[PDB]
Structure formats: C-alpha cells, structure tokens
C-alpha cells in the first residue's frame, strides 16, 4: 500500500504544516501536525477541556462506530517549546492520503496548554518519531508509520515541505518526480528517539564550506534551524544590523536586509536554504525588526533541522531494520 496527502502552511510564515487526516468510521477529518520529533497521535476532542478549545475541529469517538477506549491507558507530553497536553487514549481508524491502519493509538485531549489552545488550525499532532518516544502509559503505543509499516510497497515516508506554499506527505514509496538530482542517504542514530544524523557541515551565502561535524534531528514540528552558536553567528555576521536580542528571544535583522542563503551538507552532496527562506517577518506587527530562521540551538541540548532546512530538500525518512535519512535538492 501507499498513502499521499497534501500538507499546508497554517500562515503566511510557515510556521507549520498541517495534514488532514481521518479519524474513525464515519470519518472525522482533523488537520494535524506531522511531527518527525515525537511519537504521539494526538487531537483536540469531545473530551477537551472546554475553555481550553477555540476553533480547533474536535475527534468525537462517541460517533465513531470503530473506536474502542484503550482501558486504563493515559498520555502526558511535553513538547521542547515548553507546550503540553494529557489525556487517555482510543483505538480507531485511522487514515492519511488513502493509507489506512486499523486499530491505531488516538490519544484524546483532556487537557491542551495556551499555545495549543491559541492556535485555531492546528487540530492536534501526529508523530513520525520512533515508537520508544512514545508516552502512552502502562502501555507504549505505536506510531502510525510503525503501525503502516509492513503494508506499504517500501517501509519510508518522504517530507516535501512547500516555501509558502503547499506539499506533500507520501508513505509507501519516493515519488522520483519530485526532486532534482540523486537522493544522499545518511547513518541515523536512533538512541534518542529521533531521527538523528550527522551534517557534514556549512556555508553562509556565497563563502566556503567548512567541514565540521553537526548532530541533529530532521524535526518537522520545529520550525527554524538551530545549530551551534559558532555557526549561527557566522551567518548573522553577514547582515548588517543583525544581533541577538534577549528580549525578543534570538538573533533579529532589519527587516529591509536581503539575506544570504544557508548551505548544510549530506555527506558529499549539499542543501542550499534560499535567504527568503530565513525571514520570519516583524518580531511584531509593524516593527522594521524581523526576526530570524537560523537560531542557536545552545540552550536546546540538540541541535534540529527544522521546517526552515528541510523545506528546502525532498527528505527521506527510511524506515528499513536500519534506517537512514536521505535528503535531495528539488
């Protein structure tokens, strides 16, 4: 089998993706948020707290003749932006761009915090994270990729990110159509959870490389690129006007700055992000300072390749007995 869904940016700025998805028989079609840095499948429901949901379609698994409560199980995460939410747990159908799995772990909101609440277009998170993240208790739940895995006619999904524009999730297959070039597939470490890999280093705009090893995480829930404080601030270095506010959280730029573009590499090969790509516009409505794509990971503990590097690449999740990541120009 296969699966393929189209995937939206929820603003003008990227600041994420959502997916629609259908849930339980007759379908409830929610919009969630691909999430390759976790492991859970959760949504906005009829068990929300109700001042906690504004706008938010809800997952109603008293009107899903598939659904069956997952006995005593409950679910509790936290997420790096300092976001949470809880709740207990169903099994229903589940399906994503023709892709259908029986019996998947639907974890129910009973609690969301403000972020999530805030955020009218985001019906909750699907997680592409490996399964030990997983945070459903007594009982560890699958993924929904771990679940469709043997199904599918090769076990990968592959993550094409539109810059302001829409894309595409595709599960069971690599749509050679899709990207430029050859794909370079690269070691992943799953120690952590996460599918992480090692860049093989960095220019900014139209410099030379430098060879330096960078650890991190293809994380599409992330938005921007976080990377070592050394390597950040030799890309800020080439705008002029660029600093690191504490105030607003991160380095910010004059707004009237054309940018230099940002490379990393994938063994030999190499992913250029356009400038534009780096813009993330006023640090508030009206105000000539912008605020920046490429931030420092140094107070994260890891470093992540967010929406910011991996729109630029057609990315390949591959789920083999080992995986790896595979990343190409489009």
């Not at 050679?176 to 220019?203: L, R």
Request: glycine share 12%.
């Amino acid at each position: 089998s296969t699966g393929s869904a189209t995937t939206t940016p929820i603003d003008s700025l990227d600041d994420a993706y959502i997916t629609p998805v259908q849930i339980g028989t007759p379908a409830q079609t929610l919009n969630l948020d691909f999430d390759t840095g976790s492991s859970d499948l959760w949504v906005f429901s009829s068990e929300t707290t109700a001042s906690e949901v504004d706008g938010q379609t809800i997952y109603t698994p008293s009107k899903s003749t598939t659904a069956k409560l997952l006995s005593g199980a409950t679910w509790s995460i936290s997420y790096g932006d300092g976001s949470s939410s809880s709740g207990d747990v169903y099994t229903d159908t589940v399906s994503v761009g023709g892709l259908t799995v029986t019996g998947q772990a639907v974890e129910s909101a009973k609690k969301v915090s403000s972020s999530f609440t805030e955020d009218s277009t985001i019906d909750g998170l699907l997680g592409l994270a490996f399964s030990t993240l997983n945070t459903v208790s007594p009982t560890q739940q699958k993924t929904f990729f771990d679940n469709a895995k043997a199904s599918l006619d090769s076990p990968v999904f592959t993550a094409d990110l539109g810059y302001h524009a829409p894309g595409t999730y595709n599960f069971g297959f690599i749509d050679t159509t899709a990207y430029t070039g050859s794909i370079t597939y690269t070691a992943v470490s799953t120690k952590q959870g996460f599918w992480e890999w090692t860049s093989t280093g960095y220019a900014v705009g139209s410099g030379t490389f430098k060879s330096t090893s960078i650890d991190g995480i293809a994380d599409t829930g992330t938005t921007l690129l976080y990377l070592p404080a050394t390597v950040v601030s030799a890309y800020w270095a080439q705008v002029s006007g660029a600093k690191s506010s504490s105030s607003v959280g991160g380095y910010v730029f004059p707004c009237s700055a054309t940018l230099p573009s940002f490379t990393f590499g994938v063994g030999s090969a190499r992913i250029v992000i356009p400038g534009d790509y780096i813009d993330f516009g006023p640090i508030s409505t009206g105000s000539s300072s912008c605020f920046g794509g490429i931030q420092s990971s140094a107070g994260i503990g890891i470093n992540i390749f967010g929406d910011v590097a991996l729109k630029a690449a057609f990315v390949v999740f591959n789920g083999a007995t080992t995986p790896t990541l595979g990343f190409a120009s489009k």
